[PDB]
Every structure is written in structure tokens, then in C-alpha cells.
Amino acid sequence: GSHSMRYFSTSVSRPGRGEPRFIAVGYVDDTQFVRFDSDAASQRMEPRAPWIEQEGPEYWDEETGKVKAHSQTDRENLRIALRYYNQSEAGSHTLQMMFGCDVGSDGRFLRGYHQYAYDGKDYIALKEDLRSWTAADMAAQITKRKWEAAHVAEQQRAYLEGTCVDGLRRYLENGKETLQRTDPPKTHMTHHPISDHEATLRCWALGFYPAEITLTWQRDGEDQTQDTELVETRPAGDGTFQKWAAVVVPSGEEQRYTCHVQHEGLPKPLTLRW
């Protein structure tokens, strides 16, 4: 199926506590493979997946330089942002960045991303056509004009459709026996009386990969959306993921409710009934 490479970086200013903290991580699909941390001693891009170890010293040299360079420019961008928003240098602020590309089954390019967020909200982003920018506000528009003048978009576009998809293609091959993997969820149901006339039905999905999944409750064959509780998908820590959906039901009416599970690793969607 399709695949993605993504880089996430977070810069956090610490007034009266030294330089801003910079943390970058790299993902192929739902598997992390590298990290960088400006507060760590190594001061290098570190491997966080087995299949990336097989990269030579050059790779680690190049990647380390790029991510270190980026930390310094986002460091400065935090300064520049204070100016644009007329904010004091006594407060702490955040600069987030996502970058990456998507490829189909045939390894062909599908989509590219280059996005920034200041204090948790959109700042500037490269549109889907990778030709123009989306400025979120008055401040980001200043940057947008700069990036237009400096032709940043054409540079990033080429990199996304080229270097990125080529890098993604290589990573997949190297992480073949691990990234082409598709683990179906093990499902089960729990049941607990909330009181003398009500019980909780909780639908479980465990040990699946990738993380993408859909858990749905129906009552008498009809989606029971509003009344449901649905937790965020969570990492088990072993490379697989977990999730559950719960409904509060009248005691003795358990059989009316059905849980429906959709996942890439499943031949057909599952149905669970207590």
C-alpha cells in the first residue's frame, strides 16, 4: 500500500534558562527511525530503528549537520516571531515543523508536506500543489513574501518529489521485513456493571500495525456515535498499537449492541457482540 516519511521538529524557548530546546524525530509510517536532541550529549542524529543502523558514517554526518543547522535557524525564527507578534522575550514559545512525502504502492510520489506552527497554531505551509504558500495570519504573510522572493517553494518541491521519495524508497527496502509488515488487531470485549440497571461494554483492539483503525458501536444495526467513548490510539511500546471504544448500556440489553472493527490487516471488518 501507500507509505510516508515524516520529520517532526519542536523548538521551545526558555527565557532565563539558556538556548531554546530543539527536538527532532523521523518517521517512516508509524515507525520512528531517528531522533535529535539539543540537550543530549551525543549532539548527533541518533538511530532509533534497527534498519537504519546499516547506514554509513556519511549519512550520519550529513543528517547531523542538517538537523543541527535547522535547530539554529528555528532558534532565530523564534526571535523573529517575537518581533512579528510584538511579544516579550520573557515568555516561552513553541515552533513546530513537519516535513515529508507520500508514495503509493508503486513507490510513486503522491503528496508532499512542509509546514510550520507557532504556539500550537498554523503559521505557514506549502500548499498541496507545492507551488504556493498558505499564510495563517498577518505575521506569516511577511514570511510568505520572503519565501516567495527567495523561491523556497520550487526548491522544496523538487526535494519532496525527488530526494524525499528516493529516500523513502531506500528506507522501505532496508526496513523491508519490518515496514512492509501489517499486523491485524486482536479483539476482545470487556463488561462491567456501572450500577443495577446499567453496564459498560468496552471494545478492544490490540497488537495491530499500522495505527490507522476504526472502532464503531452500533445499536440495533445503527451507528451509536454521540453516546460512545473513544480513546486515542496508543503505542503498546513494542511497535504495535492499542485502542478501545465503550458504550454505557441498559442492563439486559447488551445483545442489541455491536462493535465493528476496521483495519488494513483484516480480510473483512470484524463484528463483536457480548
Binding site: Y7, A24, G26, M45, E62, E63, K66, V67, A69, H70, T73, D74, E76, N77, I80, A81, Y84, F99, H114, I142, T143, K146, W147, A150, V152, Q155, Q156, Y159, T163, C164, G167
Partner: peptide
């Protein structure tokens, strides 16, 4: 491969 971020000046 980490992007080239030189021109990402705000």
C-alpha cells in the same frame, strides 16, 4: 533524509 532548511528564515 532531513530537509535543507537554510532558506527557512521567517
Amino acid at each position: 533524509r532531513y530537509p535543507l532548511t537554510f532558506g527557512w528564515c521567517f
